[PDB]
Design a protein around this motif. Structure first.
Motif, PDB file in Angstrom:
ATOM      1  N   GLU A  81       0.828  -1.199   0.000  1.00  5.83           N
ATOM      2  CA  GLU A  81       0.000   0.000   0.000  1.00  5.83           C
ATOM      3  C   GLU A  81       0.866   1.254   0.000  1.00  5.83           C
ATOM      4  O   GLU A  81       0.601   2.196  -0.746  1.00  5.83           O
ATOM      5  N   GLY A  82       1.900   1.256   0.844  1.00  4.02           N
ATOM      6  CA  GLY A  82       2.761   2.423   0.943  1.00  4.02           C
ATOM      7  C   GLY A  82       3.450   2.760  -0.365  1.00  4.02           C
ATOM      8  O   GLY A  82       3.523   3.927  -0.756  1.00  4.02           O
ATOM      9  N   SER A  83       3.968   1.743  -1.058  1.00  5.62           N
ATOM     10  CA  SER A  83       4.582   1.975  -2.361  1.00  5.62           C
ATOM     11  C   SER A  83       3.557   2.502  -3.359  1.00  5.62           C
ATOM     12  O   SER A  83       3.834   3.436  -4.119  1.00  5.62           O
ATOM     13  N   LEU A  84       2.362   1.908  -3.368  1.00  4.85           N
ATOM     14  CA  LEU A  84       1.301   2.389  -4.246  1.00  4.85           C
ATOM     15  C   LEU A  84       0.840   3.786  -3.844  1.00  4.85           C
ATOM     16  O   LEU A  84       0.565   4.628  -4.707  1.00  4.85           O
ATOM     17  N   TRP A  85       0.742   4.045  -2.538  1.00  6.44           N
ATOM     18  CA  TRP A  85       0.265   5.342  -2.065  1.00  6.44           C
ATOM     19  C   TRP A  85       1.181   6.473  -2.513  1.00  6.44           C
ATOM     20  O   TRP A  85       0.718   7.460  -3.095  1.00  6.44           O
ATOM     21  N   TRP A  86       2.483   6.349  -2.248  1.00  3.86           N
ATOM     22  CA  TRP A  86       3.401   7.447  -2.530  1.00  3.86           C
ATOM     23  C   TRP A  86       3.507   7.718  -4.025  1.00  3.86           C
ATOM     24  O   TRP A  86       3.617   8.876  -4.444  1.00  3.86           O
ATOM     25  N   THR A  87       3.487   6.666  -4.845  1.00  4.38           N
ATOM     26  CA  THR A  87       3.511   6.864  -6.290  1.00  4.38           C
ATOM     27  C   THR A  87       2.262   7.592  -6.769  1.00  4.38           C
ATOM     28  O   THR A  87       2.343   8.494  -7.609  1.00  4.38           O
ATOM     29  N   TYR A  88       1.093   7.214  -6.243  1.00  5.89           N
ATOM     30  CA  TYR A  88      -0.153   7.815  -6.705  1.00  5.89           C
ATOM     31  C   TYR A  88      -0.271   9.266  -6.253  1.00  5.89           C
ATOM     32  O   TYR A  88      -0.607  10.148  -7.052  1.00  5.89           O
ATOM     33  N   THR A  89      -0.001   9.536  -4.973  1.00  7.21           N
ATOM     34  CA  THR A  89      -0.146  10.899  -4.474  1.00  7.21           C
ATOM     35  C   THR A  89       0.897  11.833  -5.074  1.00  7.21           C
ATOM     36  O   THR A  89       0.673  13.047  -5.144  1.00  7.21           O
TER      37      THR A  89
END
Lengths: 189, 189
Positions: free
Chosen positions: B101-109
Motif C-alpha cells: 500500500e505504501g509503495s502504491l500510495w506514494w507513487t499515486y499521491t
C-alpha cells in the motif's frame, strides 16, 4: 533672341554699378536657372521613394516636405526683382513720348529699394521653409494616411544643395551691390 | 486505434474522480486540439501581413510576437501532464511482473501532485508570454530591420481567442479536480 535687345535698353539709363555689375549678376542667375539647374529638379517626384505599401503615402509626404519647388521659388524671385526695372523703362518711354530730375530721382531710388526688399524676402522664405540650405537624403513622414512614421528618400540631394548654395550666394552679393548704390546716392543727396 | 486500448488500461487503477472526470476532460482537450484547433493555426505565418517594403521585416515581427505557437504549447502541456499517469502504469506492470500500500500510495499521491504543477506552470506561461488570453488584430513592431514602427495584422484573431479561452477554462477545471483528489486522500490519511 529679342531678350538681348531688351538688355541693351536696360543697360543704358543706369549708374556704373547698376549698368554693369547688377545686370551681369542678373543674367548670371538666369543662365544658372535655365541651362543648368532646371533639369536637376526634373525627377523630383518621379524618383521620390518611400518604404511603404500604403497607397497615397508618397503623394502626401512629398507635398509635406516640398510645398513649393526650389526652382519655382527662384523663378518667382527673378520675376519680382525684374519688374521695377521694367516699370522704369515704360515710365521713361512714356515720359519721352509726352515730351515730344526729381521725377527721375524718386522713381530710381524707389526701384532699387524694392529690389532689396524682394531679395531679402525670398531669401528669408528659403530659410524658414527648408530649415537651412542643405537638403537631406532621408525625410521621416507621419502624415495621414502613412502608418506610423515612414522613411522616404530624396532624389539628387547633393547636387540640389550645390545649386542652392550657389543661388543664395549670388543673391547675397546682389543685396550688397544695391545697398552700396543707396549709399552713393545718400551722400550725394 | 490502439489509443482506445491504452485508455482502458489507464481507466482502471484510479479513484472515482480520477477514473471518470479527469480522463474524460483529458480526452476532451485532445479532441479539441486535434480535430478542431490545429487547422485554425495552419496559416499563422502565411497570412501574417505587414505594411512595409522592407525585406525580412515580416520574419522578425512574427517571431517577436509569437515565440512559440499556441498549439505547440498545448501539445507540450498534454504530453507533460500525461507522463506521470504513464509512469504509474509501467511501475504497476513492473510490480506485478516481479510478484509472479505504501509503495502504491506514494507513487499515486506524487503523480497527481506533478499534474497540478505542470497545469499551473503552462497556464502561467500562456499569461506572461501573450499578456492575456485575447489576441489582437494589430501588432506594432519596431525590431530591426523594420524601419521605425511597422503595422502587422494577425490571421484569424477572433477564432484563436475562442479556442484559447476554451482550453484555459478546461485546464482550470482539471486543476480543481486534482485539488479535490488531494483533499479526499488528505482527510483519509
Amino acid at each position: 533672341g529679342t531678350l538681348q535687345t531688351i538688355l541693351g535698353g536696360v543697360n543704358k539709363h543706369s549708374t556704373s554699378i547698376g549698368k554693369i555689375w547688377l545686370t551681369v549678376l542678373f543674367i548670371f542667375r538666369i543662365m544658372i536657372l535655365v541651362v543648368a539647374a532646371k533639369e536637376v529638379w526634373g525627377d523630383e517626384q518621379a524618383d521620390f521613394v518611400c518604404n511603404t505599401l500604403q497607397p497615397g503615402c508618397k503623394n502626401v509626404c512629398y507635398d509635406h516636405y516640398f510645398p513649393i519647388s526650389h526652382i519655382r521659388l527662384w523663378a518667382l524671385q527673378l520675376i519680382f526683382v525684374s519688374t521695377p526695372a521694367l516699370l522704369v523703362a515704360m515710365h521713361v518711354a512714356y515720359r519721352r513720348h509726352e515730351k515730344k530730375e526729381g521725377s527721375l530721382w524718386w522713381t530710381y531710388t524707389s526701384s532699387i529699394f524694392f529690389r532689396v526688399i524682394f531679395e531679402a524676402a525670398f531669401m528669408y522664405v528659403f530659410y524658414v521653409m527648408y530649415d537651412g540650405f542643405s537638403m537631406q537624403r532621408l525625410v521621416k513622414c507621419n502624415a495621414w494616411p502613412c502608418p506610423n512614421t515612414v522613411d522616404c528618400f530624396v532624389s539628387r540631394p547633393t547636387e540640389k544643395t550645390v545649386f542652392t548654395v550657389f543661388m543664395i550666394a549670388v543673391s547675397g552679393i546682389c543685396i550688397l551691390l544695391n545697398v552700396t548704390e543707396l549709399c552713393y546716392l545718400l551722400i550725394r543727396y
